[PDB]
Subunit: 700 residues, 2 copies
């Protein structure tokens, strides 16, 4: 048909039996896509939405990218989607959604790898009627087929998902859903799945909004509709929602101390950072979040530089052009906001949420955060370096000024996060030596012991992150996290104990610690109260404080030590039937003997590797230059403050031209500066959250 | 023939033409070896030496192992061998060698990899008549052939090797040579080549002595005979010779400062360490050296534990059993010396030498020394741990005592080499702070600058050795070596300057530096004079002193950071002739549709990796535990001596229960202890060399 392989094989008699309990419900269509994603329209490839008597104008296209997820995660995502669609078809007073909105929504499941996909998921997919085995082809007319497209409109919905089963039923209350199962055949990464979603089927369907989901992310009963409502404002070019950690049956997972930490971290992030950024107009949407992008807004330059990167490039490598892939989705946001002659803004929707599952062991936690930290660091660097693009866009003067201010503040936060390695050690060492030097009881030996414990855990973390893999050594990482938590406890004890003794004595530089610690805690709590989600402030808060030194001295170290994933990397056969082989006049020729010799004589008379190894060498050099600069700059700060690195020796020698004192006023000055910075950051984020809630309330 | 593939195809008419200028000169025999090395005799595989009317009893078997060497290196080795054979056939007053000794010597060339071999070498090999293309088979009777054996007795010899050609002639003065070209087909390592040499063809030939050569190692005009003469003493179970760096045409390569360093290092090693060990009776033969092993001595337990390792082992891993492969050839020596009920000794022959080619760039130099350092470290650890085996052997009481003493002294040297990382820094820092503290002029800033330069070059060396590869970053390694050489120059200047000023003033702890530095230099020079090879003592000596800090702070770091090489790591096709394909009743069946669905339904109802990854994880853990212990122990020494690591702070706090002084007497005590150790080592090696020369002279 039209030069492409197609097939319409009716679904199983069983499925068709319940579906009946029109043509598109009754056949399942297959399509062998053998072209590039950016050639779907010109190759005469189409989708059923475009074949009926009246073509279907789609309003919302939902992309689910699955790699090897079990049927539970995918079933969770699909159940969320079907619940949303049922809500949107039961809506009464609405111009867009209605009893036939099931026709304006398309679900696109871009599976990755025919080898990698879990059959557990294909069981669910075929049970829904969007897939069946037998007619998947491996190459068509000397061309390898790039992916397989199965299209069905199933009338069944998942209504219950226990810990082991998914309940599929077909009643008068179920709604049809337009599935579209894409299935790549070889393991190309997530960016290629997005390339198929955006440059491929979105070019044929022409949706209004394009929503990106993952496998295992459950949207709420009402989340997708609330995210769709954000695009009423014609200036909105993107949006995102809140991300909740799901705690399992009656919050059983809170007993794990690595899940409570992430619960508090997620809810703090959503309450403070997302609202503060959304006030200005530019967001940097969280990885696990589900986002939506107006097709017109992302169409053109944003997509082009998200997929291919900076085109202007010679045969050699350039820094931003060849590393931008580390900040994958955060380039779409930056290019949408700063589009030329266009005033798109990014908005954060709090009425839309989705509950995802978080890692529960340290190895996978570290491996997950390795991508987040690198992405956030490179995205901030790039966005700060290219802030002049804000003044070439179409925004008004006030919105350009606001975006410039936000880009400066984001780089300020990145600069703070870069020096955390030295900041934590400086605070810890100054505090432990100050209390020892003031009270003398047993804190001298504790100071020495804790200095040595940190150094044995920092050195080992560097070495294992540079050479080993987290899965190989999990017990050591658990031990390191426990040791850092104990050090945190000791730091808290020192601060409280000296503050209490100074209160009894009344010093300023230590009673100030009480002043700030209370201010930032109260700002956190007041923001939580205003956001109307305050239970995290006590339920899962302590574990965040204890596993916070391990987020600054383990996740950061592994993230920086693993910037890029560097993977370095006949004739003749005899089978005699029975003591007898094949004879001939070949070789017997003597002239050939003088001819299979003269050639060899001449070869004793006559007297850079591929692009992959070159790119790998460049990536390794970049990774080892970043690490070295990080360590050197942090030690520069430490040696300037504590007078380590032989500086105190040098000053003593100049004075002789004496001996080293125990502590100086630089320690006090630095100790005040750090808490001032922390207080300023907390104040800024509190003000941002307050403005967000006030504006939202007035608009509502 | 006998169930194995054979072929006797006369050599090229050209070759045969000059050979004539008997049967074995005229045919070249091929053999497809499809068994294991330890099965050659039982498989009814033989070699021509065993087929004549009178079987040939071989006296000397020479093994040359080549991997991808050009025809120049292999031609060099072959020319050395043919010169030796000519010398041994022209000998007059000898019971063994004579006009027919060409019959008692077999050359075995165990090439590795049909894919890896350089055709440049096959040109030379076929030009000699020991190889010709066309009848090499890839598998025989459903069995893959393991290697190809070509056997010829060529009458041509190489008589001149210019920089670009090898001169092959056939006169009345040439001698026949019994070549035997082994050619493995897949890249198995050198230990498997030795397994073929020892468990394979040596089992058929039954030689008296087995000599191991490499491609590119040129034995002298008389070296092999002088090595053979060492086995007259029935107690000798092995032997080795001197290794000379060849300097090229009129010593042009001495202009390179990385070749002069290795020249001096090699000649010092041969003069001191080999003679000192050979006095006791156990040697640990240098890597590039060519060695000989009596077959009876190595036959049995030594070979068995060289090839397979410790047999007693459960499913899990053990340290020595699973890492002994790092000390490859040094296990043969240890097992020969300590053989049960046998009194074999290892002797060092100085009358036999061989000139090899040394690396001239820093990346390949580091990569070469990475194997030497790991091998020497593990071999010393194993030999010290198993010294009790010396008292279970057959030696007399005095020789057991001598071997025990030697094993203790070797581990003492290893223990010294383990702490060199801290020793160098301690000496450097104490010296630079002492001169600054005494003279004040400009040495304060130099002390700070040099402390920072060392730390920026040590940190970078750790990071690049752990993450990167030497070939990727050569400029930085050159820069680091230059910086370390400048630091060495500054240390020498400080020592000389303070010693001169103390001489003018007359302190003891610095004029002592002059006392030792002169004693060790004079012992070096006197040993060189006695060994009668004194030109290295001035020609290539300075470059060894300047590139010595880079042998302690670059080769060691890379060797320890790279202990083991950790490499982590369908149906359907359509080709329509013309808009028409293959149709059938397959799939059309509806029952199958309900059958390709019920299976999937059930798969949604039903509700450690391989040995390689486990071994890789174990190896990585071992590598990262060794590194951590090395760094921790060296810093323990440094912090105890210099009172770093917060110890001085702790002592000051106890005294308050004051402030840190600049330097203590621990620095003086350590500084004296180090030079005392150096003087003791130099004295021991000088005495060993003197005893060696005196004994050899008296015996001669
Ligand atoms: C240590 C024990 C374990 C050793 C383990 C193994 C050996 C490793 C080298 C240890 C060298 C210690 C030297 C020393 O005295 O430390 C000093 C600095 O302390 C630090 O800043 C070091 C922190 C630990 C780094 C460990 C290496 C990890 C890689 C790199 C990771 C990033 C490193 C940078 C992070 C910001 C101690 O400072 P102080 O004396 O308290 O200051 C007052 C000085 N005064 C009295 C003159 C006023
Ligand atoms: C540094 C600049 C570059 C930083 C680069 C980058 C940051 C790395 C951490 C630097 C921490 C320095 C802390 C410091 O003051 O150093 C101290 C120790 O000095 C050493 O022993 C450190 C030697 C360099 C190690 C660099 C790390 C490489 C990995 C590990 C390699 C193996 C490490 C162990 C090798 C034996 C200085 O000692 P001192 O003050 O002169 O002693 C007298 C003290 N007193 C006055 C109280 C009496
Ligand atoms: C290197 C690594 O171990 N990554 C970890 C991390 O990354 P992280 O969670 O960032 O990444 P995910 O693998 O979860 O990727 C998110 C989306 O990508 C799809 N998709 C598609 C193609 C592809 O190559 N990769 C891919 O992930 C995924 O199923 C999902 O749809 O998350 C999890 C920890 O809880 C673990 O699964 C992993 O240990
Ligand atoms: C990892 C590495 O880079 N090794 C380096 C080093 O090791 P090094 O010199 O120790 O090792 P060699 O490769 O020279 O090995 C010696 C003998 O082994 C044969 N043989 C056989 C099989 C096999 O797998 N390997 C093998 O080496 C060799 O040709 C030779 O006959 O020496 C040289 C530096 O000047 C370089 O060639 C290499 O950069
Ligand atoms: Mg997931
Ligand atoms: Mg070689």
């Amino acid at each position: 048909w039209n030069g492409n392989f197609v097939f319409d094989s009716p679904i199983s008699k069983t499925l068709l039996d319940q579906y009946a309990t029109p043509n598109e419900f009754k056949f399942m269509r297959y399509q062998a896509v053998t072209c590039e994603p950016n050639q779907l329209a010109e190759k005469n490839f189409t989708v059923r939405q475009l074949k009926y008597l009246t073509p279907r104008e789609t309003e919302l296209m939902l992309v689910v990218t699955m790699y090897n997820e079990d049927h539970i995660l995918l079933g969770r995502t699909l159940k969320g989607i079907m619940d949303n669609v049922k809500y949107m078809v039961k809506k009464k007073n609405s111009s867009t959604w209605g009893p036939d909105a099931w026709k304006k929504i398309v679900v696109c499941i871009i599976s990755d790898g025919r080898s990698k996909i879990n059959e557990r998921s294909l069981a669910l997919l075929s049970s829904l009627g969007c897939y069946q085995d037998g007619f998947a082809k491996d190459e068509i007319n000397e061309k390898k087929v790039a992916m397989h497209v199965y299209e069905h409109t199933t009338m069944i919905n998942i209504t219950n998902i226990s810990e082991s089963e998914v309940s599929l039923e077909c009643n008068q209350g179920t709604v049809p859903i337009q599935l579209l199962f894409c299935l790549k055949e070889q393991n190309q990464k997530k960016i290629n799945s997005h390339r198929w979603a955006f440059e491929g089927f979105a070019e044929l369907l022409r949706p209004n909004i394009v929503t990106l989901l993952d496998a295992g992310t459950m949207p709420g009963k009402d989340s997708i509709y609330q995210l769709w409502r954000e695009f009423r404002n014609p200036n909105v070019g993107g949006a995102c929602g809140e991300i909740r950690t799901d705690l399992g049956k009656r919050f059983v997972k809170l007993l794990n101390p690595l899940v409570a930490s992430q619960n508090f971290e997620y809810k703090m992030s959503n309450i403070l950072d997302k609202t503060t950024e959304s006030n200005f107009g530019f967001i940097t949407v969280l990885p696990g979040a589900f986002s939506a992008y107006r097709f017109e807004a992302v169409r053109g330059q944003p997509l082009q530089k998200y997929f291919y990167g900076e085109i202007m490039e010679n045969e050699g490598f350039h820094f931003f052009s060849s590393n931008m892939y580390l900040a994958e989705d955060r380039i779409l946001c930056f290019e949408v906001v700063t589009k030329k002659n266009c005033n798109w803004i990014l908005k954060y929707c709090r009425s839309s949420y989705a509950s995802t599952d978080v890692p529960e062991r340290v190895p996978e936690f570290i491996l997950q955060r390795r991508r987040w930290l690198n992405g956030s660091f490179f995205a901030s660097v790039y966005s700060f370096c290219h802030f002049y693009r804000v003044w070439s866009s179409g925004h008004n003067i006030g919105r350009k000024l606001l975006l410039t201010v936000e880009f400066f503040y984001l780089f300020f936060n990145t600069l703070i996060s870069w020096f955390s390695l030295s900041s934590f050690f400086l605070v810890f060492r100054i505090l432990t030596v100050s209390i020892a030097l003031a009270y003398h009881s047993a804190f001298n030996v504790l100071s020495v012991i804790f200095l040595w414990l940190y150094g044995i855990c920092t050195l080992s973390t560097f070495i294992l992150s540079l050479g080993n893999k987290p899965k190989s050594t999990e017990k050591f990482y658990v031990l390191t996290c426990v040791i850092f938590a104990v050090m945190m406890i000791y730091m808290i004890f020192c601060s409280i104990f000296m503050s209490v003794k100074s209160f009894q004595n009344i010093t300023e530089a230590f009673r100030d610690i009480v002043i700030s610690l209370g201010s930032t805690y109260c700002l956190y709590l007041i923001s939580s109260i205003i956001y109307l989600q305050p239970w995290h402030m006590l339920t899962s808060f302590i574990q965040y404080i204890l596993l916070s030194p391990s987020y600054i001295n383990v996740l950061n170290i592994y993230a920086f030590c693993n910037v890029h994933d560097l993977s370095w990397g006949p004739l003749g056969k005899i089978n005699t039937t029975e003591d007898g082989t094949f004879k001939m006049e070949v070789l017997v020729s003597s002239s050939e003997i003088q001819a299979n010799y003269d050639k060899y004589l001449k070869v004793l008379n006559d007297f850079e590797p591929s692009y992959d190894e070159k790119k790998t060498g460049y990536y390794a050099n970049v990774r080892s230059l970043v690490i070295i600069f990080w360590v050197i700059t942090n030690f520069i700060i430490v040696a300037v403050v504590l007078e380590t690195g032989g500086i105190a020796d040098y000053i003593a020698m100049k004075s002789i031209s004496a001996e080293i004192p125990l502590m100086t006023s630089k320690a006090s000055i630095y100790f005040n500066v750090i808490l001032w910075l922390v207080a300023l950051s907390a104040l800024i984020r509190f003000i941002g959250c307050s403005i967000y809630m006030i504006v939202r309330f007035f608009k509502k």
